[PDB]
């Protein structure tokens, strides 16, 4: 029916016009007066060795000390970052994991990958071993990202162009967040854990309401597939990273691309993005073997975290914002501070 | 220096390190293969000769070599998002059905897929064990239907040997990296010797890699 197509066209036009109407000025113009942060020299405090394959994901614990790491050797290594002690080494049923999550409480760890199953491992067992607490099956594509709402419910994103809110106890999809045209690659929980943003391969980041279970806003602007996404600390903005070698800060309330972070010397894709505690620094992991720390308000390349011998796959910032942990394909986890 | 608990935790970490080491040494000897076919290209036949969702693991030992074959059928999404997962695969067992040239076109799609995989930036130093399955059916199909229906400007006889040789040559094209060596082999239904040619190809790839590391290639 052409009436629906033309009506959707006029709708898109109305959305674009509404977005443009409220865009009176740019963040770059407003932030020209503020003093620019001086260059930051973060040193490699620790190097976590032990993985024997490409590290694909990591997730800091809420105590900012423990961190879990997932690689292609079928191992979930939970490290003690302070002492570089391997706290746990969980052997994976499928050695094809692309994500790993640490529960806020610090009791469970979730991972998954090309097996299309979100394996949840209980750490606080009376037997003193880590056993598979739950096997969340149902996604028809590879599991790209997973984040715990709490110990009972977990949101995951899959390569079948779908996010799913699961209830761990029952092991069924409580909610199904559909709408992305391309494979959903990243997730980012809002601080209040009410809404979440998901960046897919259709060059669009979609905001979903966890309770209602349906999309709220859609943000476009990237010229390629989005790989990473991360909320701003306050929970009103979020930054994305794509294969077009650009970071994009969008604002939820303004509902439009707020600012871009691109350099003419950078051409490789982006794999991970994270904010500092205050949100002033935007740390992005690139495929040029090093991480770049940008000024979130000036788009000035504050620093370059170099040292990894392969593509930077994942990075995370602690809850207290003390150090940043970068996991790369060279099978190394470097902690920078 | 360290307290009793810190020392016991360090000992635990050392035991974990030792286990990770042993597991790595045990797993490093495995020959990892990627069965990358195209639908009804003869993946089920070749895997049945060698031996709900997600990739399929086929592990088999043959003459002191443990081959771990990975079949990626359930992944209907875009390839590139998980091709990097199999970056260090020893070889790609690419299966193509010779019969599927006139009927659908199927053959053009197989050539396009082969082009995409062979020229992928992750598969640069990766050899392809090309299998031309269902040769029996092509035996009579070429005698009934000419090969020109699929490949314009063939300009050759529609016989048995030369038609397959041409198809093989057209598949050996679209190969740029000199390091890549396509071990084209024509199979038919079930022969119970495709494991032997797989072993011979794998050992040739291993030798090539060793000589490349030493600096002789």
């Amino acid at each position: 029916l052409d009436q629906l197509r033309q009506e959707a066209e006029q709708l898109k036009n109305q959305i674009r016009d509404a977005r443009k109407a409220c865009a009176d000025a740019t963040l770059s113009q407003i932030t020209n007066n503020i003093d620019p942060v001086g260059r930051i020299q973060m040193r490699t405090r620790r190097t976590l060795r032990g993985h024997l394959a490409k590290i694909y994901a990591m997730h800091w614990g809420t105590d900012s000390r423990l961190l879990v790491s997932a690689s292609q050797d079928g191992k979930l290594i939970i490290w003690d970052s302070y002492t570089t002690n391997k706290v746990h080494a969980i052997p994976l049923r499928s050695s094809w994991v692309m994500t790993c999550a640490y529960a806020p409480s610090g009791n469970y760890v979730a991972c998954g990958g090309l097996d299309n199953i979100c394996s949840i491992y209980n750490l606080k067992t009376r037997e003193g071993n880590v056993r598979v607490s739950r096997e969340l099956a149902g996604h028809t594509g590879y599991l790209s990202c997973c984040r715990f709402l709490d110990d009972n419910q977990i949101v995951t994103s899959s390569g079948d162009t779908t996010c799913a809110l699961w209830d761990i106890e029952t092991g069924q999809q409580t909610t199904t967040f559909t709408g992305h045209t391309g494979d959903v690659m990243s997730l980012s929980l809002a601080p209040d854990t009410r809404l979440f943003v998901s960046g897919a391969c259709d060059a669009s980041a979609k905001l979903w309401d966890v309770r209602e279970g349906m999309c709220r806003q859609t943000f476009t602007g990237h010229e390629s597939d989005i790989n990473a996404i991360c909320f701003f600390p306050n929970g009103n903005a979020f930054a994305t990273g794509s294969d077009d070698a650009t970071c994009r800060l969008f604002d939820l309330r303004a509902d439009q691309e707020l600012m871009t972070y691109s350099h003419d010397n950078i051409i490789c894709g982006i794999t991970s993005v994270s904010f500092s505690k205050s949100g002033r620094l935007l740390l992005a992991g690139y495929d040029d073997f090093n991480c770049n720390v940008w000024d979130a308000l000036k788009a000035d390349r504050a620093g370059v975290l170099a040292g990894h011998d392969n593509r930077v796959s994942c990075l995370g910032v602690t809850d207290d914002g003390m150090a940043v942990a970068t996991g790369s394909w060279d099978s190394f986890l470097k902690i920078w501070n | 220096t360290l307290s009793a608990e810190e020392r016991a935790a360090l000992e635990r970490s050392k035991a974990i390190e030792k286990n990770l080491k042993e597991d790595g040494i045990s797993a490093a000897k495995d020959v990892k293969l990627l069965l990358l076919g195209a639908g009804e290209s003869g993946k089920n036949t070749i895997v049945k000769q060698m031996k709900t969702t997600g990739i399929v693991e086929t592990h088999f030992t043959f003459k002191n070599l443990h081959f771990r074959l990975f079949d990626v059928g359930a992944q209907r999404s875009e390839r590139k998002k998980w091709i990097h997962c199999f970056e260090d695969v020893t070889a790609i067992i690419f299966c193509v059905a010779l019969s599927g040239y006139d009927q659908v076109n199927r053959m053009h799609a197989s050539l396009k897929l082969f082009d995409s995989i062979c020229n992928n930036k992750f598969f640069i130093d990766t050899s392809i064990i090309l299998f031309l399955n269902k040769k029996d059916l092509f035996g009579e199909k070429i005698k009934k239907s000419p090969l020109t229906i699929c490949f314009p400007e063939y300009t050759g006889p529609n016989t048995y040997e030369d038609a397959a040789a041409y198809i093989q040559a057209q598949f050996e094209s679209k190969n740029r990296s000199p390091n890549k060596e396509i071990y084209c082999h024509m199979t038919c239904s079930t022969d119970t010797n495709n494991i032997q040619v797989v072993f011979d190809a794998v050992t040739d790839i291993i030798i090539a890699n060793n000589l490349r590391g030493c600096g002789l290639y």
Partner: single-chain antibody
Framework: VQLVESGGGLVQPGGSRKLSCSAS????????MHWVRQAPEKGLEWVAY????????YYADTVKGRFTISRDDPKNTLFLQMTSLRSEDTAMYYC??????????????WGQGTTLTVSSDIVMTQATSSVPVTPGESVSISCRSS???????????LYWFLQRPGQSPQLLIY???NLASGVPDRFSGSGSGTAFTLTISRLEAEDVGVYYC?????????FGAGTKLEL
């Protein structure tokens, strides 16, 4: 999870005895095992420890040479071969599991114990002994250490244990703060380096028993005298 130990009996002073504790219901291979004895009508006294993998073995100064501890992972068993005995070696020998990693709760589970009879360090003190309480009000048990337990890393290695009358000691608190799994929130441990306090907000019928304060800063592990709370 259970530890069933056997071997306890009447032994001549010069005789040898082989205590065998069979563990079942948990990953025995990955737990550090302690032989801790309680003399008749006396407090706890740590005897020996063997780490996960039999890598590290410690003995008390009073049993060095005479006693030997050995582990059998295949069959999940702990052995205590005591060669030479004395009149002071009669005790109730408990097998205590203790896994050691960051955030772990060592000494969480205790075995039933075997009553065997026969024919410098951190001086842990309490100076409390008997405390006569009626159920309902708060109770404050004070433990004092000869040496400051606050390690530079930033935690104190104090362990509150509850031994109910005629039962195996149970872990109440570890690192003087963290309550053990299954312990109600009434128990609250506090302290500073030397002086430590265990507070029970509301005492019930089941709280009657002996309260031991153990140090875990460095071997040998020394228990307190034991504060007995009763009606």
């Amino acid at each position: 999870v259970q530890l069933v130990e056997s071997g306890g009996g009447l032994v001549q002073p010069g005789g040898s005895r082989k205590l065998s504790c069979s563990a079942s219901g948990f990953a025995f291979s990955s737990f550090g095992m302690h032989w801790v004895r309680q003399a008749p009508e006396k407090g706890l006294e740590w005897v020996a420890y063997i780490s996960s993998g039999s890598g590290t073995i410690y003995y008390a100064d009073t049993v060095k040479g005479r006693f030997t501890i050995s582990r059998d992972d295949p069959k999940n068993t702990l052995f205590l071969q005591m060669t030479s005995l004395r009149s002071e070696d009669t005790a109730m020998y408990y097998c205590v599991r203790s896994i050691y990693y960051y955030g772990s709760s060592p000494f969480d589970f205790w075995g039933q114990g075997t009553t065997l009879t026969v024919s410098s360090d951190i001086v842990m003190t309490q100076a409390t002994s008997s405390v006569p309480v009626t159920p309902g009000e708060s109770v404050s048990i004070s433990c004092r250490s000869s040496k400051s337990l606050l390690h530079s890393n930033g935690n104190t290695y104090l362990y509150w244990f509850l031994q109910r009358p005629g039962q195996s000691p149970q872990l109440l608190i570890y690192r003087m703060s963290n309550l053990a799994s299954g312990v109600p929130d009434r128990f609250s441990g506090s302290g500073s380096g030397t002086a430590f306090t265990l507070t029970i907000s509301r005492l019930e019928a089941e709280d009657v028993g002996v309260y031991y304060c153990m140090q875990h800063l460095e071997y040998p592990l020394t228990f307190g005298a034991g504060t007995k709370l009763e009606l």
